[PDB]
Symmetry: C2
Amino acid sequence: MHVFPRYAAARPEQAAELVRSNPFALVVSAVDGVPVATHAPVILEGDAVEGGTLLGHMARANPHWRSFASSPDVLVVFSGPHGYVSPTVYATDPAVPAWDYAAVHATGRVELAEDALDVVERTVAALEAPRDPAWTPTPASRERFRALLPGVVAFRVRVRTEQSMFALSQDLDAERYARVREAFAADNPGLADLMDRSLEHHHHHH
Amino acid sequence: MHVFPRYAAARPEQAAELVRSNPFALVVSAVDGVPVATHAPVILEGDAVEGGTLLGHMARANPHWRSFASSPDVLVVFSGPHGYVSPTVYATDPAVPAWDYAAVHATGRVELAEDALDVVERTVAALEAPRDPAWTPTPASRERFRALLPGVVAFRVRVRTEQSMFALSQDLDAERYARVREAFAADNPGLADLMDRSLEHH
Ligand code: HEM
Ligand code: HEM
Ligand SMILES: N[C@@H](CCCNO)C(=O)O
């Protein structure tokens, strides 16, 4: 991923916030030049993404993890809200379309986790935390977890590099920016909310 | 991606529909053993993903495309609607959470494209077609495209292999499926539409 200056994060807290808010990630490995990717829930351990640890799990039946065992470098992509920006919204000429989006790419060494149960239970807690009410597993569900555990492979990623993109129309003029934000306000409110949060302190001439 | 048989596409048209509906894709290649990925609009030429050709572009300033000069294998991930399934909506015990989603993974040999203006103009037409009204580039805008061409790199992927996941609760019993479909109707209607379209076929 190439982070254009105009779309860089202002603060590392932005990268961590996006990761926590969007835990259904893409786990990617490379084997003899061929990328293979699994969609999996991945959670963040620590205050920052770089130097932090990611925890996730996939199916034991998914052969992807058998390339982890040598501890190669993996990439985990976290994706936030996104949306196509039509030049119709700009109401200007000349114009060029854009796609607004935010993502965090975490690269590091993967290893198999010893405590798969801890990983899936910590995943439950994190994914339910923002909900009301938060589902807490019952003894019977916990018994079911332990019975399902043979089918799980859990893994850790020690993040060596974090790259973050916040392509959120910050390079438009104020009038065009307002038009884009209003257009996303209907039917993509998650992206308009991200636009608002991201503008607060923005890097700029920095 | 490992596609559990219960979550396989019913038809190949199902995969091609997802790719066409979700052109903002993830382009992945390997560089010294590390996966490197770029978010880019990618369109499909052909009726089917497997054996079709994907076309996309990225910045020349993004060093990722230099890995394409040797025509390695590239993975393009198309992502559809998706959503967390909380056991709260299941209203059962014991329960385990899930994440419902649909995605197409297309892998094949990449080739840098000389016809970069062709690729970006075909991308405009494809991404504007579902809009009413659609934006047609004016002469001024097409001149601006030409002015921008030195800074863009276009590429083609000839898809060798396609894997498609449609994990949309269709393995649930009628009662629990209805609660999941009802839950997504509110605040994830794109997923709700995708569950409807997935049922029966297509
Ligand atoms: C907290 C929310 C959770 C989500 C969103 C989630 C999601 C997923 C996903 C997407 C996969 C497929 C990975 C792949 O394609 O290889 C998977 C596999 C699996 N996970 Fe979870 N999981 C969660 C919690 C749990 C818990 C608590 C357990 C209890 C042990 C568990 C056990 C499993 C098992 C057994 C599989 C393999 C299933 C199979 O082979 O069909 N998961 N999970
Ligand atoms: C059709 C809708 C379009 C979308 C959704 C779109 C999206 C994008 C994206 C996401 C990137 C960044 C790629 C990266 O990370 O490397 C990009 C780069 C770029 N695209 Fe497009 N694009 C569109 C049309 C066009 C057109 C018509 C042109 C005309 C030549 C063009 C020229 C460029 C250029 C020059 C860059 C590099 C920008 C820079 O270095 O700052 N794009 N585009
Ligand atoms: N350099 C172009 C980038 C937009 C093309 N892809 O969205 C601009 O002037 O905004």
